Write an enzyme that holds these catalytic residues in place. Structure first.
Site, short mmCIF file in Angstrom:
data_model
loop_
_atom_site.label_atom_id
_atom_site.label_comp_id
_atom_site.label_asym_id
_atom_site.label_seq_id
_atom_site.Cartn_x
_atom_site.Cartn_y
_atom_site.Cartn_z
N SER A 690 0.85 -1.20 0.00
CA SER A 690 0.00 0.00 0.00
C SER A 690 0.88 1.24 0.00
O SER A 690 1.67 1.41 -0.93
CB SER A 690 -0.99 -0.06 1.15
N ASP A 768 -8.25 -5.36 -7.09
CA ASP A 768 -8.12 -4.23 -6.18
C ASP A 768 -9.00 -3.10 -6.72
O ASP A 768 -8.86 -2.73 -7.88
CB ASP A 768 -6.66 -3.84 -6.04
N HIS A 800 -7.26 -5.14 -2.33
CA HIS A 800 -6.12 -4.40 -1.77
C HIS A 800 -5.25 -5.22 -0.82
O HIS A 800 -4.03 -5.05 -0.82
CB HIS A 800 -6.57 -3.09 -1.11
N1 LIG Z 1 -7.54 5.60 1.49
C1 LIG Z 1 -6.36 5.15 2.22
C2 LIG Z 1 -5.78 3.95 1.49
O1 LIG Z 1 -6.27 2.83 1.58
N2 LIG Z 1 -4.68 4.09 0.75
C3 LIG Z 1 -4.02 3.02 0.01
C4 LIG Z 1 -2.73 3.57 -0.50
C5 LIG Z 1 -1.67 2.96 -1.15
C6 LIG Z 1 -0.59 3.72 -1.54
C7 LIG Z 1 -0.54 5.07 -1.29
C8 LIG Z 1 -1.58 5.68 -0.62
C9 LIG Z 1 -2.68 4.92 -0.24
C10 LIG Z 1 -3.91 5.31 0.50
C11 LIG Z 1 -6.67 4.75 3.66
C12 LIG Z 1 -7.35 5.86 4.46
C13 LIG Z 1 -7.57 5.39 5.90
C14 LIG Z 1 -6.29 4.82 6.59
N3 LIG Z 1 -6.69 4.01 7.76
C15 LIG Z 1 -5.55 3.50 8.51
C16 LIG Z 1 -6.10 3.20 9.92
C17 LIG Z 1 -7.54 3.81 9.96
C18 LIG Z 1 -7.57 4.72 8.72
C19 LIG Z 1 -5.50 3.87 5.68
C20 LIG Z 1 -5.30 4.45 4.29
#
Ligand SMILES: N[C@H](C(=O)N1Cc2ccccc2C1)[C@H]1CC[C@H](N2CCCC2)CC1
Ligand SMILES: N[C@H](C(=O)N1Cc2ccccc2C1)[C@H]1CC[C@H](N2CCCC2)CC1
Lengths: 823, 824
Positions: A690, A768, A800
């Site tokens: 991620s 994903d 994902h």
């Molecule tokens: N929308 C984001 C996501 O899933 N991303 C995937 C991803 C991969 C590469 C670069 C940036 C991103 C952002 C998520 C938003 C909420 C956050 N949570 C963690 C604990 C509670 C809240 C996690 C990330």
């Protein structure tokens, strides 16, 4: 020399057995405390909760006794609520709606993952199988001593009934979402009634009601689009505030369906950074019932003036709900840059019946009192970004109308999240609701009578992602969770909301705690652990004189849960700009000092996540221990942009994602090399998923002499391709940050990737729907054009995250083989 | 054994890139126009398509053929002045790009065109529009290039499949939005003739060949101009006719393939009939239109068979081919049943078609009106126990009534494709076209008066994939191509269709020729080559007295084209079942006898292709020479199932795809080991694309101790996911061959794949709309379940074959690296 420790090379079969051997269930959560109301009985409370015994998540209960010997520890029994009931659908296959919500919620476990509870009637309401079920326990119905079968609620609807909720004013009723519209029904009579008509016979059908859209769910942690009014008015009327949404102008993209043999995709409304979010508004649905429970009438209502005209700057509805008396609805609003928030009270009289007839509409408009209006009781502003904090507790209006007292978690004021008591003045200016007008700035701004800090300092109150407060009004105390003691441990605290002085900690240090307070404030549960110790769930009674409630002493009452792994060690260092960063190291097993070991820098490194804290890691991060058992050093650093350290620490990322994070990681790596004697800097791998994957690629791009290999999973490689909610908040809109978008997009820097094969492994889940496989796809495309080598692994039945255990094991075996051979 | 084993020099990735970059660092589609000037110095002008080496794209060109010569090399003259036929950055519309895939068309520019000889009118697709130019005939011969004229349109989207009306060159036809249109080129007037189209709620189309017809039956049109005009009506109106196919794709499965607009993150819907699933609903319709003296289109009419196509021809699943007799007296169609084991040639009289009306009452009247003697005539029926390959040769002679004489290419009779002369008897049984009609097993089956074999023997006439015959009716000679001399060479022959005796060869041995014959039969072109020589293109004049035209001598007239690579060597061997298989080896360059070298078995092995024949391989198979230069031995075997060896050779595949081929490959490899002493059998890699990737996976599944590594590209891993046309022909319906679908499906045998990594590299194009990416995606799914290592390479901007050179180079670099690091 002979100083360099060499990992033993295993065959693939050998690695598979090692991974299989390492891996050869979710502690109670989502509690309800219920007092018995029986002096003669041997139990003071019955505790209800969701939990999984050593197959699936299920509704459970424990009996809390009146006395414990205290010579021995008391272990509470987990009693089944349901008799031999399977809540998981057949073969663990959920509908697209239910499966997408599990994804948005990051829910891995099977069975009952949420439920609603009405205290007075003891009614439990929840999704199970691919239908709705219910059961009754406690209250007027009385307390069972053995499991009872849950009763399926019959429907003449087709497709799933999502987001079910019991009417707080009348537990005969409940609501749900069916085919992007709001429905209500009476559990006692089986009568069903539809209240919204936004959906027809889905590029054609873009309107929904009562539903949280993709970005709201993925980027704002809101999963509902409707809210029961807590009271009834007198037939008797019931109410539901609801968000109406129109996604017509939102971009459509296609993602593959899990049914691979069908070779089809699903369409999504996916607002990519820099284009249209859905059109939204707040509406109100009423319905009247008779004394026999029949739904007599229903009505669709809207704001007397358009929502877009009343609140011209509003881009997202972050949260909503009602005051406890049902007097006012409320809504937390946000602008597009996410730098301005507004808590707004909407009195129900502000809403008029929807009609096609312009005359009838003007009659209803003329009728609305001139003294009824929106009240903007709060507004938070910042230069960084507004994190949506969930705490907002409106107190009943005892001191008359014309003023409103509430608690509020605010981070923008001082740079950390703290509790404030606020009193806003509601003074009706008077409006001609019959004539349309365009409200200016600060049009409904209430003057603030007072604003008191309840908590302060270089630390934060927990108010996001499930964190909440508990307010006891008899004693004037607010209970909350925080990092006051340290950023590595969550603790439970109490402070007076009347006389903001001494904060008292109720949880034991050494451990990070996840707590649930009884609504009667006589006892709480703590689910907690340390890096060195597996989590436990203990029940604590608050004991002491009732004349000194702030200093109630929490006394251990009973335990609900207890306990080749080697815990990692937490450390800290300072950067060359004097910033304190924390880190974690898994030392190689059977370490022999003097040897330099190959090293895996395990990374996430984006906002909203903190990897380094004092809690048990052996469940989620077992693979890191596995790597350590083979003899790799594993290093984790929480660099700037990571959370639990306040806005300014997180704000180091603003408009330059990819640029700041690796330095902190490299600093941390070099620090670890001096302190601990056992790191070989010539053999360092970077690896994450991620945000971690995006950084694993940036690490290889910008620091190729430091990291010999990158294993990058599910990465975002092109920021223009990610959504509005996340991307714009931290990186602005693409028109206003071409430099950052470009400098942060790893797919546009592919020349800087290596000419040497075996230094880059890419991994990505084909299904994903968050970080679309497109990201990897476009990166390979650019790698091919630049003439660069790569290796690639696909998970064809994974979104994902990898959730199928065999795919996970394959992932870990692959990682071990890649390192063995090439690091 | 240390010195004996030759070790490939291991290069850096950048080094391998430079080697691939260093390595990589003809006229066709002819028209012979006779120049009718005695004083002039040019006998003909030869028009053709070609890419000058300096030129970027394919274009319409011409040469001047002189009256007498004294080694003449003819100039290529540009027809169009500084004209770009390729749209911007070679970006075609979805419709035109998919037709390019179906036609396996690599070159850019003008890939096809129509030509009307009397008016000298050329009609073709260029840019994203339609263009035309005039030369020869009444216009006169140009000396300098002419700017082509665009044809304006009120239509939106591409105008596909343009064709000039043979009966009147003022008119032309095209397909716009799944419907047939006509237009007058002189007046610029357009007129729509069908209304099947108004996404998935619009599954009807007219005049269009659907996916499977295109990909599996080599037909790219679904409409056919009647060649003769008519003169019937109240007052002097002229009637023109088009036969066409109406199609209903409703009940055909939908699948989504990703768009080439990657950044859009979208798919396209495709009506893809998977094996065992429904093909589109089909019929043949007729469309007439009337024109005045001024060329105005006065009226148009939608017509249809007096009885349903589905009741008149109840067993017919596919319309393979169609057309008209030269007089326009009958339309004709070639029909096929679902198992593709029964074919019918059927004549459809135009009077058999009645105007279409939704009104029940009108249809009865028009049906009653249809004469009683009018009926379909099944002039030919071909049956077999294997499968019917579709052969394009069917030449009906003019009638001189009550019978039809025609030439036919038939393979099922003897097991080889030969030319036959057939006379079918047309005798009308008499039918009430008003009443509902259910036909018998041989309802319209004409008796065959006679049937003569014009050719015979253990060899074949070429009748598919662009192969055709030329019939001269003055001399009674049919000209054709065949493997009579050998199956490794294509030659041009002449035999009498009047008197079936002596077949004369007109092409020189030692080469394989691709020939085009002049309609005047005075001149012919051969594009030919050998394994050891690059192709040539020579013009040959046929000479000798007119007393014995069979014995005219081809005499070289002029050339249109002339001319570290080391050609491969053709060889042959006999299997332990005593079958003769051909092979090809590329020896390692600078070979030192006594050394044993690592070997790449390059494979395809599926039906409809032959890799091993005597023609230049250097263009298409440069990589194999690059492998040889590094020190790999490269072997190619044409095993049973391959083509140009007749039906029974091909038929060994029947219902056991994957099961027979590897044996022939292994036999071929061990054979080559004995003859040539330079093959290290402990280091052999298997690699191919398409059928060859399927076989590379089968090679590693069934022969893991023979092949150390497999590199499989674009493979089919689950036969159930493949289409109806190809699969059902060779492997039956899945419900009738569960054993074979299962034994032939590589994804279901993943347990049999290896436990050792670096033995399998999988390659696949993300945009593949033929062998869907699904196939690889499904194999990876199964590999993960079985705990099996794999490597994988995706081509994101590529369908079934890699056409972007940047990607092609990367594919080769990847191959060399894989071999160097892991072949041992
Ligand atoms: N929308 C984001 C996501 O899933 N991303 C995937 C991803 C991969 C590469 C670069 C940036 C991103 C952002 C998520 C938003 C909420 C956050 N949570 C963690 C604990 C509670 C809240 C996690 C990330
Ligand atoms: N539709 C087939 C195809 O593309 N296949 C891909 C493929 C991959 C694995 C297993 C089977 C298959 C079949 C092609 C049909 C036309 C044929 N042409 C060769 C020369 C002229 C005709 C080649 C094969």
């Amino acid at each position: 020399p002979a100083a360099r420790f060499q990992v033993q090379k295993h065959s693939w079969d050998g690695l598979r057995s090692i991974i299989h051997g390492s891996r050869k269930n979710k502690a109670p959560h989502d509690f309800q405390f219920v007092q018995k109301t029986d002096e003669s009985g041997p139990h003071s409370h019955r505790l209800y909760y969701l939990g999984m015994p050593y197959r699936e998540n299920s509704l459970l209960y424990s009996e809390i006794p009146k006395k414990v010997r205290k010579e021995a520890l008391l272990l509470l029994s987990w009693k089944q609520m349901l008799d031999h009931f399977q809540a998981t659908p057949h073969h663990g296959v959920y509908s697209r709606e239910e499966e997408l919500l599990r994804e948005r919620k990051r829910l891995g476990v099977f069975g009952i993952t949420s439920y609603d509870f009405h205290s007075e009637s003891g009614l439990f309401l929840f999704q199970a199988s691919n239908s709705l079920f219910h059961c009754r326990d406690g209250g007027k119905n009385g307390f069972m001593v053995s499991p009872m079968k849950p009763l399926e609620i019959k429907t003449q609807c087709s497709g799933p009934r999502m987001d079910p909720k019991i009417c707080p004013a009348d537990p005969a009723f409940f609501s749900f979402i069916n085919n992007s519209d709001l429905w209500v029904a009476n559990i006692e009579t089986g009568e069903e009634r539809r209240l919204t008509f936004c959906h027809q016979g889905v590029l054609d059908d873009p309107k929904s009601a009562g539903v949280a859209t993709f970005v709201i769910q993925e980027e704002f942690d809101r999963f509902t689009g409707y809210w029961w009014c807590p009271t009834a008015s007198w037939l008797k009327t019931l109410r539901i505030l609801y968000e109406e949404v129109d996604e017509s102008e939102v971009e459509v993209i296609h993602v593959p369906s899990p049914a691979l043999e069908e070779r089809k995709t699903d369409s999504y409304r996916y607002p990519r950074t820099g284009s249209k979010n859905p059109k939204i508004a707040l509406k109100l649905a009423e319905f009247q019932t008779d004394s026999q429970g029949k739904i007599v009438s229903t009505q669709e209502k809207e704001l007397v003036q358009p929502f877009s005209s009343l609140f011209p700057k509003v881009e997202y509805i972050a949260r909503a709900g009602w005051t406890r008396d049902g007097k006012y609805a409320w809504a937390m609003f946000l602008d597009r840059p996410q730098q301005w928030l507004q808590l707004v009270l909407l009195p129900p009289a502000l809403f008029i019946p929807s009609t096609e007839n312009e005359e009838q509409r003007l009659a209803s408009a003329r009728a609305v009192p001139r003294n009824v209006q929106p009240y903007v009781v709060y507004e938070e502003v910042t230069n960084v970004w507004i994190n949506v904090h969930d705490i907002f507790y409106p107190f009943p209006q005892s001191e008359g109308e014309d003023e409103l007292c509430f608690l509020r978690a605010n981070e923008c004021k001082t740079g950390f999240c703290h509790l404030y008591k606020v009193t806003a003045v509601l003074k009706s200016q008077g409006y001609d609701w019959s004539e349309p007008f365009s409200p200016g700035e600060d049009e409904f701004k209430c003057p603030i009578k007072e604003e008191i800090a309840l908590t302060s300092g270089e630390w934060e109150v927990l108010a996001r992602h499930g964190s909440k407060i508990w307010v006891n009004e008899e004693t004037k105390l607010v209970y909350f969770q925080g990092t006051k003691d340290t950023p590595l441990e969550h603790h439970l605290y109490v402070v007076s909301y009347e006389a903001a002085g001494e904060i008292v900690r109720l949880t034991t240090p050494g451990f990070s705690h996840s707590c649930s307070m009884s609504q009667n404030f006589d006892m709480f549960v703590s689910h907690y652990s340390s890096v060195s110790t597996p989590p436990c769930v203990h029940v604590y009674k608050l004991s002491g004189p009732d004349d000194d409630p702030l200093h109630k002493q929490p006394r251990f009452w009973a335990s609900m849960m207890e306990a080749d792994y080697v815990p990692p060690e937490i450390f800290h260092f300072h950067t060359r700009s004097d910033v304190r960063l924390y880190g974690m190291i898994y030392k190689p097993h059977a370490l022999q000092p003097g040897k330099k070991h190959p090293t895996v820098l395990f990374v996430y490194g984006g906002p909203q996540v903190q990897l380094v804290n004092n809690s048990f890691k052996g469940i989620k991060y077992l693979r890191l221990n596995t790597l350590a058992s083979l003899g790799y050093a594993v290093v984790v650093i929480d660099g700037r942009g990571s959370c639990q350290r306040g806005l300014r620490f997180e704000g180091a990322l603003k408009n330059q994602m990819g640029q700041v994070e690796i330095e902190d990681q490299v600093e941390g790596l070099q620090f670890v090399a001096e302190k601990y004697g056992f790191i070989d800097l010539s053999r360092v791998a970077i690896h994450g998923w991620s945000y971690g994957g995006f950084l694993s690629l940036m690490g290889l791009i910008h620091k190729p002499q430091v990291f010999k290999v990158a294993i990058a999973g599910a990465p975002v490689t092109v920021w223009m391709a990610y959504d509005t909610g996340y991307t714009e908040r931290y990186m602005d809109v693409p028109e206003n940050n071409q430099h950052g978008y470009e400098a942060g997009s790893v797919a546009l820097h592919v020349e800087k990737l290596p000419n040497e094969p075996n230094r880059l492994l890419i991994l990505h889940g084909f299904l994903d729907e968050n970080v679309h496989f497109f990201h990897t796809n476009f990166l390979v495309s650019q790698l091919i054009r630049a003439g660069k080598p790569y290796q690639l692994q696909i998970y064809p039945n994974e979104r994902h995250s990898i959730r199928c255990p065999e795919s996970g094991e394959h992932y870990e075996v692959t990682l071990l083989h890649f390192l063995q051979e090439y690091l």
